[PDB]
Amino acid sequence: MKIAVIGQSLFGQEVYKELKNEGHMIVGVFTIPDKDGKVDPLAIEAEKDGVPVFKFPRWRLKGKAITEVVDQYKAVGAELNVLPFCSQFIPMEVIDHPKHGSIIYHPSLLPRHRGASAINWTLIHGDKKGGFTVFWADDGLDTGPILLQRECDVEPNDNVNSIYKRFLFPEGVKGMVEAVRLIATGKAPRIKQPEEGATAECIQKKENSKIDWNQPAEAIHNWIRGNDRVPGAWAEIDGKSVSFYGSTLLENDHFSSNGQPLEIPGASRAALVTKNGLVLFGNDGKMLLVKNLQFEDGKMIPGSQYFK
Template identity: 30%
Template sequence: MNIVYMGTPEIAAVILEKLIHSKHHIQAVVTQPDKPKGRGKQMQASPVKELALNHNIPVYQPLKAKEEAFLAILKEINPDIIVVAAFGQILTKSVLELPKYGCINVHASLLPKYRGAAPIQWAIIDGEEKTGITIMHMDAGIDTGDMILKEEILIAPKETAGTLHDKLAVCGGSLLLKALEEIEAGTAVREKQEETEATYVKVLDKAMGHLNFREPAIKLERFIRGLNPWPSAYTYLEGKTLKIWDAEVLDETMDGQPGEVVRITRDSIVIKTGQGSLALKEIQLEGKKRITVDAFLRGFNLQQGTILN
């Protein structure tokens, strides 16, 4: 089929790579405009744009996909189908109805659960045992369209958003090709979502990463994994940001106040929480590299009783 592909971040680039090496023809790629990044604020292209340019695929970056000028371009391209994966913009009815086979979306959750922009992270934060990929026909709602195919993936005990992202990206590419084959053959079965089971997740931001040690240790540990690698979980040590990359839950009840360093071992810093304790294993002090706790303790004189806040 002739395809216009819409996507922006790394997960969308992995899926696009799979599509590039399939029998289908990618007429164009649509992605978000370049954005300033890093300390130098230099303009940086999205992973999808970089991949498309490497394969000599035309790239379009409309500020808004509903712009008349962009709609005219889409009509001229006249794709059989539009494939969307983490594009970052809501498509209007005029775009959704333009292709012969409509628009389909590769969504990183088992719909109708976890509609919205951060399903991978929230599945971990909420303690789900599994998640997956859903291929769905798009309608005017946010992730509300009819489902075509689903594939489940188990969430490992130490799964981070980063490792789960990589698994889902690979799964998404393979499932997309299967869905395209069924759509082209006219054998795709559309299943309506059960609205009573729908959940929506909010967008992540850096402020969310500030840990509240009054919460139970099990919740904090999931939070740390769910925000790894971005926006990352953190606290403050002596006025400096301390990012926490890995931690383990201890069922022990210890004396102290939430956020207090109640024990220091060779390779862990144990923090009192609202329920149980949290053993920090890998951390990163502001201005320093990410290191294991044993390496950190060799260069930092941390005292029992110190409060992280």
């Protein structure tokens, strides 16, 4: 069928590539402008194929969509919009245009974790299960009827990158391709999202990924892994903003109080720099271990190396 792909990143590129390989006519790719150095992976693959690339800035403003952004979109004659990873909200004029409407990839088990940082919040809340949903776009934020959903176990030490790479990305691509196949064969469903279990959270950025030390250790571990790698959980240490990556919970033994103490303002008590990383304490007397640290405009350093 005729498809407009609206989105970005490696994920949008892989979905584009698979749909093209399945015989679909990609009539247009609508993506972010270069930054301004690198061209987005999706525009690169599209032009390599001879497919109309668009780099619109934003569609909405003053409560409204333009006509110059709408009209260039409508020209390509899409029968379905596919929104693999779309960094912004798209006007209903665009969303409702094609005969089949629009489908969106969302890396959570909707109606849980509506919002743009769903993977982060899945881990921050310490959910045992996670996954993704392909849903039909409506005017609300991640509220549209479900086409399909796929589920996975969240591992205790999963960070954003590991669950994404293990499951959300590769299976998300297959889910998007399957959704289109169900649509093309005329069998795709529209399951209204249940009321029960709905949540929505804010988008995670550097500023609001600051660590709140007054929480039990498990909560701090979840907060850290839930913001690892991006935006990167952080705290003030000795005047510097320091980011924390690679958290695990640390049980036994003592332990080991053989590190060099490291004072962290607001921490329930001083941290310990050990050969295996930075031991941190929650407000419940329990411990977590952080493998890697990072300063502003700096490389990753092992927590074990803080004092050298």
